[PDB]
A and B are shown apart, each in its own frame.
Chain A
Amino acid sequence: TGRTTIAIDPVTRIEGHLKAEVVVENGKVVDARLSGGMYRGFETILRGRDPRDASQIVQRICGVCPTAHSTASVLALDEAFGAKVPNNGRITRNLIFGANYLQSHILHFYHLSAQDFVQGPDTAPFVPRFPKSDLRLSKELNKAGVDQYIEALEVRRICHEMVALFGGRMPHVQGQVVGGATEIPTKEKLVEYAARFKKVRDFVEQKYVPVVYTIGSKYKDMFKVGQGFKAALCVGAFPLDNSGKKHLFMPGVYAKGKDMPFDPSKIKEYVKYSWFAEETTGLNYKEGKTIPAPDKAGAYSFVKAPRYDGLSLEVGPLARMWVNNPELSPVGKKLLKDLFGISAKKFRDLGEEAAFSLMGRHVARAEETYYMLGAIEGWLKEIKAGEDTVVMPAVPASAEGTGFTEAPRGSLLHYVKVKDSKIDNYQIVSASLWNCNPRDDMGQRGAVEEALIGIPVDDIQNPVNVARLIRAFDPXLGCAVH
């Protein structure tokens, strides 16, 4: 037939268990299936527990982004308990969480993605690899890549020291609970935090953001693939006031060239192609049910298929920088000129096609890292040693709440229903669920499955661009399936 099917299981240098299956014709991807192959069932594990237990249990969905689930959880708990988080505790939450944005983005580019473009030393785990691995950097630039990977191992560890200062430990913080944060920042620890922050600030400014633009300039073809639907979701994150109004990332949807506001009732989860009971399809999260069906004909994945008003959307740094359209970093303004001969001030000046591209998503992630440095500076101005950060609310007998935030990889919400003072339902809708999901009941592909269309596979023996595309979305399958 001229169609050749390639399967990759595991997709490595992601988090979690992913199988990718593509079909290649005339040297280009023409059809795709993504399979999240591992299930735990947190949504049923949690039922019947003290609702306060959730802000610990849910972090164990993902050890790379546990602070996103913590944050989502305690916001749902806050609403359900009627807890009025103290201002100083809102900011302390922001500092715990923002710091893992830095760890997560640095982890992803250097330690997950960079080997797509940089050859490591000649020892495991850096060899063996594809004989034709398509690595274009010069001996000089490749040695830059390698030294920065090794430096980034220190930088990300320091980020987790920042998270831990007010979070207790990382992975899996103890410091965020219903009602705020469990430990008031002292003058001393704010000093230890800012000391670490500066080292990360300078590595981000001087090494990380340049190296992304530099490596992209050697891979300009990679701005021309990976567009998929050019549709994106942002649900808001990092409250800046205590009224629920201003957020560092503000909500919004983009589809068919159209900006629109974000309406959470238009979220539904389809399971036709997912291993869950057929009778649970099309449910909004407040009515969601998780009934595993691992033998269901036609299904190929433990990831449900979420759609927004029936749209298949993508989430993550690209999506947020597009919706919010901030100003580009200064280093990004310069290097887009010297290396791409491009002039741009804000994020959307890159244009739709380049931003919604394989290498565009890496660029968004680097820019957002810089942007987050400013937020963390601001909150370090704002926090005030000694002011209380938590209230101690009682568990309601009956109540519900929803917490919306943005995880490093994209949009996240937790929904909790309380009955008889116990969890009655807990539903999770996570970032890599929006990105790595299979087809919905209407046969529409997930975001990554679609972005895979048109990826070049000139050499079936070295189909390196298939996983290159996937890695650009920074997938974690623990979060997608939970």
Chain B
Amino acid sequence: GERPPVFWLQGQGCTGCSVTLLNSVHPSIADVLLKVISLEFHPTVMAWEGEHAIEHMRKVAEKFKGKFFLVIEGSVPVEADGKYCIIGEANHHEISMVDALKEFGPNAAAVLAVGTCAAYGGIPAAEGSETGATAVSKFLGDNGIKTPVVNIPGCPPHPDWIVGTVVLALDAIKKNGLEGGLAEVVKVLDSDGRPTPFFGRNIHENCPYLDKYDEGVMSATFTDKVGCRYDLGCKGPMTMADCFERKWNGGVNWCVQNAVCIGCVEPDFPDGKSPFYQA
């Protein structure tokens, strides 16, 4: 089959969701780029630059109207008429993330909001912020764009969650065609827009220290790995993700083993999960 065209736009992101993708193990990132997708615009890694890069994205977008996938990393700031995130300049006119999402969002086959920033607002929308950081879905609904949106959250997401969502959706489309599969993709989303293969299970319900939680056996220093981390601030109890099983960075560790879960996949992250180091 064909590798669909993908455009990856960064709003108020830290580039963490591109880096975590580079850590994908099976398939590696190179297989993703050469065999799974055609990444036509990504400002961190692409060859061309500036106005030419934007005009290349717009020619592909015109060519493949309704058929291209848009990845959005980072949140969308709406205050100051979008001046808190300018992402480009073409034709002597600056382009805000507000502009870009209104340009490209209505013509994408689907939008993948990658990371908790994009999915839910996350740290840029947190108490103390001033920029109007808005989640992608809210922004699209707010300007009346109906393109389906998939949330792949995490700060950062696990690479397997990103790759995995893409492969599920591209197989659904191969199976059912494009309208058909995207309905099958939407069918597997929870009430927060997240795919249930990865965010369907609660951390706490599956933690290997659940025995100790129930025994009331609690570690009092981080370096004591026998007890449950609850008293140290573990937010497993309110967090739906599968890191307990697949773990992180080629399986060599994960947040509950090393320290605590800070609940980075959840819509209330970070404020509703803070303080991080008290229950």
**Which residues of chain B are near A161, meaning CB under 8 Å?**
249-250, 252
**Which residues of chain A are near B33, meaning CB under 8 Å?**
123, 125
**Known contacts A10-B88, A19-B89, A37-B87: does B222 contact A183 (CB below 8 Å)?**
yes
**Which residues of chain B are near A41, meaning CB under 8 Å?**
124, 128-131
Bound-state Cα–Cα, A160 to B19, Å: 10
**Which residues of chain A are near B19, meaning CB under 8 Å?**
63-64, 160, 171
CB of A163 closer than 8 Å to a CB of B? yes
**Which residues of chain B are near A66, meaning CB under 8 Å?**
14, 16
**Known contacts A12-B44, A12-B53, A123-B38: does B253 contact A39 (CB below 8 Å)?**
no
**Known contacts A123-B38, A478-B15: does B49 contact A112 (CB below 8 Å)?**
no
Tally of chain A residues near chain B (CB < 8 A): 87
**Which residues of chain A are near B92, meaning CB under 8 Å?**
7
Q: Which of B134-166 contact A (CB under 8 A)?
A: 155-156
Closest CB of chain A to B258's CB: distance in Å?
3
CB of A430 closer than 8 Å to a CB of B? no
Pick the residue among B87, B220, B259 that contacts A168 (CB under 8 A): B259
Interface size class on chain B is: 35 or more
Q: Which of B38-95 contact A (CB under 8 A)?
A: 38-53, 56, 77, 80, 83-89, 92, 94-95
Bound-state Cα–Cα, A170 to B155, Å: 10
**Which residues of chain B are near A272, meaning CB under 8 Å?**
none
Bound-state Cα–Cα, A165 to B49, Å: 36
Pick the residue among A10, A47, A64 that contacts B43 (CB under 8 A): A10
Pick the residue among B49, B223, B249 that contacts A169 (CB under 8 A): B249
**Which residues of chain A are near B131, meaning CB under 8 Å?**
39-41, 292
Q: Which residue of B lies closest to A89 (CB)?
A: B223
* Binding stretch for chain A, among B174-182, B197-205, B209-217, B268-276: B268-276
Bound-state Cα–Cα, A177 to B16, Å: 20
Contact (Cβ within 8 A) B84 A182: no
CB of B196 closer than 8 Å to a CB of A? no
Quick one: which of A35, A154, A165, A169 has the most chain B CB within 10 A? A169
**Known contacts A49-B274, A157-B22: does B259 contact A62 (CB below 8 Å)?**
no
Q: Which residue of A lies closest to B5 (CB)?
A: A124
Closest CB of chain B to A480's CB: distance in Å?
12
**Known contacts A53-B275, A57-B270: does B87 contact A183 (CB below 8 Å)?**
no
CB of B107 closer than 8 Å to a CB of A? no
Contact (Cβ within 8 A) A46 B128: yes
Q: Which residue of A lies closest to B75 (CB)?
A: A40
Quick one: which of B5, B220, B221 has the most chain A CB within 10 A? B221
**Known contacts A12-B44, A52-B277: does B15 contact A47 (CB below 8 Å)?**
no
Contact (Cβ within 8 A) B53 A171: no
> B-facing mask of A283-294, CB < 8 A → 1, else 0?
000000000101
Q: Which residue of B lies closest to A35 (CB)?
A: B86
CB of B240 closer than 8 Å to a CB of A? no
CB of A230 closer than 8 Å to a CB of B? no
Contact (Cβ within 8 A) B128 A60: no
CB of A253 closer than 8 Å to a CB of B? no
* Binding stretch for chain B, among A236-244, A351-359, A367-375, A387-395: A387-395
CB of A329 closer than 8 Å to a CB of B? no
Closest CB of chain B to A457's CB: distance in Å?
14
CB of B189 closer than 8 Å to a CB of A? no
Bound-state Cα–Cα, A87 to B129, Å: 38
Contact (Cβ within 8 A) B46 A125: yes
* Binding stretch for chain B, among A25-33, A126-134, A333-341, A376-384: A126-134
18 contacts between A and B (CB under 8 A): A12-B44, A37-B85, A39-B77, A39-B131, A40-B129, A40-B133, A41-B128, A50-B277, A66-B16, A164-B253, A165-B253, A167-B258, A169-B255, A172-B16, A174-B260, A177-B277, A182-B259, A183-B259
Which residues of A line the B interface, CB within 8 A? 7-17, 19, 35, 37-42, 44-50, 52-53, 56-57, 60-64, 66, 107, 111-112, 115, 120-121, 123-130, 150, 153-154, 156-157, 160-161, 163-172, 174-175, 177, 182-184, 189, 192, 292, 294-295, 302, 388-392, 467, 476, 478
Ranked 8 nearest A-B pairs via Cβ: A63-B16, A168-B258, A164-B249, A37-B86, A174-B259, A169-B248, A9-B89, A182-B222
